[PDB]
Design an enzyme around this catalytic site. Structure first.
Site, short mmCIF file in Angstrom:
data_model
loop_
_atom_site.label_atom_id
_atom_site.label_comp_id
_atom_site.label_asym_id
_atom_site.label_seq_id
_atom_site.Cartn_x
_atom_site.Cartn_y
_atom_site.Cartn_z
N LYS A 47 0.76 -1.21 -0.07
CA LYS A 47 -0.31 0.09 -0.11
C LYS A 47 0.77 1.22 -0.24
CE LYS A 47 -2.97 -1.98 2.86
NZ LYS A 47 -3.33 -3.25 2.01
N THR A 48 1.93 1.26 0.54
CA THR A 48 2.90 2.29 0.61
C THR A 48 3.24 2.94 -0.63
OG1 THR A 48 4.26 1.37 2.49
CG2 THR A 48 5.28 2.93 1.19
N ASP A 93 0.86 3.23 8.02
CA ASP A 93 0.50 1.89 7.65
C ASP A 93 0.02 0.98 8.77
OD1 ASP A 93 2.55 -0.35 5.91
OD2 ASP A 93 0.52 -0.66 6.43
N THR A 142 -3.90 -4.38 7.02
CA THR A 142 -3.80 -5.82 6.62
C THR A 142 -5.18 -6.73 7.15
OG1 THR A 142 -2.42 -6.18 8.65
CG2 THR A 142 -1.58 -5.89 6.58
N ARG A 201 4.50 -8.01 -3.74
CA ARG A 201 5.38 -8.21 -2.79
C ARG A 201 5.98 -9.49 -3.17
NH1 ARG A 201 3.77 -7.11 3.19
NH2 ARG A 201 3.69 -4.85 2.10
MG LIG Z 1 6.00 0.79 5.28
#
Ligand SMILES: [Mg+2]
Ligand SMILES: Nc1ncnc2[nH]cnc12
Length: 314
Positions: A47-48, A93, A142, A201
């Site tokens: 998401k970053t 986050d 998450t 990822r």
């Molecule tokens: Mg991060």
């Protein structure tokens, strides 16, 4: 560590990009006060990056941070009150896991841009009220679960991210690859995408165990077969399962006959940590419809038997 800058260069999450585009432009015209966005995302989803984009699009700075990272209120104050100038983005986050207090401080700041603070120590100390500039906070999770109390209330935009399509992943594996110093046919990358797990990822994190295995002798190319041999050697079935995952089903199927097991004795006999088992492997397994949790215990889908090349029972 170079990544996409523009909301365009971002590989994936179209619905979300559009949805974001709407909120941005409408706001670049209206004003830089982009409402407090909250991205929900399956576990393990980048998401970053998107935040850097949303930040770049809006043309402002981005102060990234975890939920844990925020250790004491001070840290949160010190960021909203100093590091940040009007219009910037504070990215919390894993926002679902903040300090009970740290959270209680985020409320005010997000709502009216004013945070109080316990100056000094003991009874010989007072309380001050720090006024914060207008910033936009982007919270990622998450565990989308309402495991986010009324902190949810104070959010403007609330969107979700879906997994990435093997192609989107490949597109990324190759886009990230080629420019990185290695060359590989699309079929190859896309064969790594499929093998990945909807996760970008992991997509790139797998490709790493490929480009590190094959291009050791022959350098200038990685074709499917090349990659294939790689993935192959590494223990990756066309279903994405890692060597161990397989074994878990394996034991389930054979050791306990699949019949209700119980994480308990499964992890035990499977010689592993229950939490590890339950928290790391089981997921994808359940998602791939191979494992199933039941009041009676862990059990393997037909598909499990059918995958491990067995005769789905009765
Ligand atoms: Mg991060
Ligand atoms: N959308 C994206 N495109 C390319 N690389 C990424 N890494 C994480 N998210 C990404």
């Amino acid at each position: 560590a170079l990544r996409p800058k523009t909301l365009d260069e971002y590989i994936g999450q179209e619905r979300l990009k559009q949805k974001l585009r709407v909120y941005l432009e409408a706001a670049k015209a209206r004003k830089e006060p982009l409402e407090h966005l909250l991205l929900f995302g399956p576990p393990g989803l980048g998401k970053t990056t998107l935040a850097h984009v949303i930040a770049h699009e809006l043309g402002v700075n981005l102060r990234v941070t975890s939920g844990p990272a925020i250790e004491k209120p001070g840290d949160l104050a010190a960021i909203l009150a100093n590091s940040l100038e009007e219009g910037d983005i504070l990215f919390i986050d894993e926002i679902h896991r903040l300090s009970r207090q740290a959270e209680e401080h985020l409320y005010p700041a997000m709502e009216d841009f004013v945070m109080d603070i316990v100056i000094g120590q003991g009874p010989a100390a007072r309380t001050i009220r720090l006024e914060l500039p207008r910033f936009t906070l982007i919270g990622a999770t998450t565990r989308p679960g309402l495991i986010t109390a009324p902190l949810l209330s104070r959010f403007g935009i609330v969107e979700h991210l879906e997994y990435y399509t093997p192609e989107e992943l490949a597109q990324g594996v190759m886009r990230d690859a080629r420019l990185l110093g290695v060359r590989i046919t699309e079929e190859a990358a896309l064969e790594i995408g499929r093998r990945s797990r909807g996760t970008m990822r992991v997509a790139k994190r797998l490709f790493r165990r490929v480009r590190d295995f094959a291009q050791v002798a022959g350098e200038e190319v990685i074709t499917r077969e090349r990659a294939l041999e790689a993935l192959a050697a590494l223990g990756l079935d066309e279903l994405g399962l890692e060597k161990r995952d397989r074994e878990i089903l394996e034991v389930l199927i054979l050791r306990f006959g699949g019949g209700p097991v119980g994480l308990a004795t499964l992890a035990t006999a499977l010689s592993e940590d229950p939490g590890t088992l339950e928290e790391v492997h089981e997921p994808y397994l359940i998602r791939q419809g191979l494992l199933k949790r039941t009041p009676r215990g862990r059990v393997p889908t037909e598909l499990a038997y059918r995958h491990l090349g067995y005769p789905p029972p009765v």
